[PDB]
Amino acid sequence: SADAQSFLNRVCGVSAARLTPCGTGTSTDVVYRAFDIYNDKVAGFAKFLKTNCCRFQEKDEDDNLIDSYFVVKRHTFSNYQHEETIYNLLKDCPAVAKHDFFKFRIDGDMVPHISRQRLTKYTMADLVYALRHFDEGNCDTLKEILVTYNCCDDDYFNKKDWYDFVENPDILRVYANLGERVRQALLKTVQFCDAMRNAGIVGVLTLDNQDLNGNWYDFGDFIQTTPGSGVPVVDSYYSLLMPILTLTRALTAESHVDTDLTKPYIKWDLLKYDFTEERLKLFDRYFKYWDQTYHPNCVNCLDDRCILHCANFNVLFSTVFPPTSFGPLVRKIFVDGVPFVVSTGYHFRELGVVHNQDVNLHSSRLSFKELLVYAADPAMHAASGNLLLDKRTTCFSVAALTNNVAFQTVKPGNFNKDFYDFAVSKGFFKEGSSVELKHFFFAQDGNAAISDYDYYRYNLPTMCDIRQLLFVVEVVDKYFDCYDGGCINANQVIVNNLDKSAGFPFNKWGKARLYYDSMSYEDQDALFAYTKRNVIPTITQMNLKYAISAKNRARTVAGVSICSTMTNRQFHQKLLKSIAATRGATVVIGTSKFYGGWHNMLKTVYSDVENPHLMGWDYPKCDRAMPNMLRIMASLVLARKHTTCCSLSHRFYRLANECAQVLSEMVMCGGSLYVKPGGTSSGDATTAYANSVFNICQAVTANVNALLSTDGNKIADKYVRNLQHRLYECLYRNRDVDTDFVNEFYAYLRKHFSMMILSDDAVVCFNSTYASQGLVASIKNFKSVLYYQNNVFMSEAKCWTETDLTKGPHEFCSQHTMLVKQGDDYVYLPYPDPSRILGAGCFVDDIVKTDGTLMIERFVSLAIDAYPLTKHPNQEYADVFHLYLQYIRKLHDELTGHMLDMYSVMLTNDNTSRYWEPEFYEAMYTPHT
Amino acid sequence: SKMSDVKCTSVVLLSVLQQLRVESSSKLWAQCVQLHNDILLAKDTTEAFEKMVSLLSVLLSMQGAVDINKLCE
């Protein structure tokens, strides 16, 4: 056709470029670019059809195809005059892709074209969408982006698990090759925002109008004002691009001299801690027109939402500053002449520079409170201890406290032979039988403790999307409104297990009983008020756990020091004992599975969901790879109860105490301190509850992403269309908490995505018609949000979907379920994996519980946990409970025989007649008690 | 089974080796737990028995530890 070859000539124009007609000679329907729009038809960040573009493609010398396209928009002349009016006022800025405006007779009409110059194949929103709505099968746009910008060759993608972060952590390097591309795009955004400020034009800046070279193009939705007074609305832009700024590490070039990637690293002054001036310099370079007040040090913050806001920027900005700057801040104080060096500060990567304020220079005496604060401090231990260069980990070591490195080995399990003989005599473990020992005590070598410490390399700096996090923190706190929390005084703290180890260095002198009994209540209250005014850093003696597993991986327990537990208990135990005693909520920590409790759990999840399926998931490396932002977000949600008992600076120093004692912390892994890049200590007070708030945050973020991933044109319902529209309003356009809409979205997710969370493992009961349309979260939305926020890949294998409600959760808390009958009522019974129960019987951690006849209450508790197997259709499973029943029979037989052979016959025999009778084990699941 | 009692035999074998202070040699104990943790994660029988042969030989290299002359009867 002459028309297409003449149009291909005219779009070239002044700038000479050989072109190939990508698409067809008319306007080209694109293959699903992602957009960020808000107008009166749709709202959200979804994939749409760009139908008005006429995309071309440049040809260089010797006819190669380049990453340089001419997006040619056909739009109306009433927009075209406005387009040229704005572009003639942004023409000198180098962050505007050129535009080449004309009109041309496609059908004899002089239809106006916007024949833009040298845009990439994709826009920033395609990159943000592909890395953010990541689907393991459908990721062709992410592959084209990583290939065309030399981040990895195309044969990188034939690798097994190329996309995963847990396996193949070279994908972090592959993504980081986009880091200068993203940073150059941020500089172009600031050039564009400066130029559109100085031209005085007003409009929202969306990701989709920015290519990968940086150059902004689209000049509709702009209104002209007086020059010097214009403002660009970059809340949706920077908010939606925030997970990519640490996924691709766009500020590693800021850690070079002159910020040039060829030049060496900045030799920072190794004593310089207070990077506040450079933090403000970074924020004025990159996030310039981000019009909410950023505080570098988060001590200057105005409420919890401002702490999340400013800590989100410090997570990005602290990847530049050297890791020998963070951690505690020590000052050589003097006590009665002899010079201590204790920590009077902390430079958090997130909460800025936090100085103490009850710092005592020239102390004369030290009370017990001050000795705990000074001994729990890593200051002495890293000052007196000698330097360590640990090449075993990538995690930054600091010191070493012994003259040699201690190696920790996990023993094998003391194999109970008597139960295994009784299991093969009663006919188990035959050929091809479906109940075989899959659970063992897997023994470990010497370097297992440090090789399991090193799984904090899965953790990363994660800059969360801050408008999503500042809305889902309100929806998560709407899930926690049924509880009552607050500070309790030292006499109100209930400690259940006093005889547990109190962390380093306090386990060199006794158990936690020693410190709760040595301190008076006034000392504990004064220590808690010290932490109300001062950050104290602590040590977690990260030891190995010796437990049954079905995998050979060692399990570590991060036993925090008692200055963290005895203050986190006073700060948090009212909310924790309220979550552990509120039945029928979303969070089911504390709800017993017995006594018909599992059935009431399941009928609470099933609360009036319209087309109810089920869905579970599991977080790959939840404790190791949880971001810093989501753990401080969970500490804030657990600290939103302190609206009366605390001030606001009290809440910040108690947040910074929790962050310096749990999140980013000096951790002792075998006689040598390391810094921990984040995650959760499992010896934390709020380790099942902040995990639970993290879990609700991932679920609500999956629902927010899923409701904005849908078209909105393609939703036949209009209530959820006008709930999507106010979701994008309350997310990226309103600052404060729109509490009517937070109540509506909470009522929406209690209707259609009803949930159940005992801390890491979750069962929802989602309205499957809406998730077929996308109006709640499927598994693909959890996979995408786990990828861009939690920085792991959650496979489709470890996530299930039980279609019929009547078979219940496939697994919740590693308990399968069934639907069986007692007393003319179909109740739900939770049954474990049968290999787990036989492995617990056959393998004992001590030798004293092998033939010392302590086994009675052991196998009684295993049979209480293994009663619902007897209602299973598989008789092979159902024989497990009778195996334990006859084994308790044989145990009581040999017990009475040996007690007759020793002294005399037993008389109180009817106390044990209930033990080998299933009256005792059925009554543990009848809901009357 | 054969699988079940070779797994339980590897468990009690490494308990015997850890009783005889093979923890003190880091390389020999790393080999012992590699053999043991490959027994217990085994779905085949013959490769479990050949690694059992290897691990029991690591026991039998210690001459003065277990008096095998009097213990077989």
Add this chain to the structure above:
Amino acid sequence: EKMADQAMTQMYKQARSEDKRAKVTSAMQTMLFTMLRKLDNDALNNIINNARDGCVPLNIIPLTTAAKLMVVIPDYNTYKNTCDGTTFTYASALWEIQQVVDADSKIVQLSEISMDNSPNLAWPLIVTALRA
């Protein structure tokens, strides 16, 4: 009668705890070789009987198609039991001999091993071999 019940059961618990703690080593080794004789594998009973009459390996028995295995041979009747020519029947796989080192650490050849040289040989024999 009532109080003495809990007294005698706590003393019985302490007695059975110390009873299992005391013979923690010898009973575990008898129990190990009990279930080894219960396994009845020919490779396992091969290794147990060779370590019975003295033929004891000096390292780990390998799994590679070719790797090194050091093993003590005490005398010559065991050598007739395990060596037929240039082979070494051991752990139910054929081991190809490559050198023999005697007690004073000299390389001893296969050809001089017979009845007449056996009182002149410095026993034991530290041989080494490769898997077939």
Add this chain to the structure above:
Amino acid sequence: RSEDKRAKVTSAMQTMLFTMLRKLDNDALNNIINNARDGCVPLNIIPLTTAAKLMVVIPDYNTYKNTCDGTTFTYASALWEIQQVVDADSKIVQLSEISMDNSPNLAWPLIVTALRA
């Protein structure tokens, strides 16, 4: 009985703090305290610049050639001379029996110990 337990743990904490103050250097540490423009110094730079000695735990021979080569190596912009090399069994390893050939015979990891020169 409780106050005696309180007294013994006060005495033990005071003892370990006073021993670990007389263990830390007071010349390089006082130099970097007085070098600090506000007297406040990050904790994870205190042992990097005022260490009495360095411990490098080396997992394999490749990281041994890359870091602790020879008898004197450089880490943390300072010259460290290898005072000792100890293997994972807490046994001495002299520098001559660490090679590419002997690396399958060493009980890895190796805990080298180096004083500051």
Add this chain to the structure above:
RNA sequence: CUACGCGUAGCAUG
């Protein structure tokens, strides 16, 4: 006779 708190032990879950 019954339930509720306390202490110890044990088991399971996260």
Add this chain to the structure above:
RNA sequence: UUCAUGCUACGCGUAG
């Protein structure tokens, strides 16, 4: 050899 939850088993205090 941690934190939090639930349930057993074993001895106490309170009330009906």
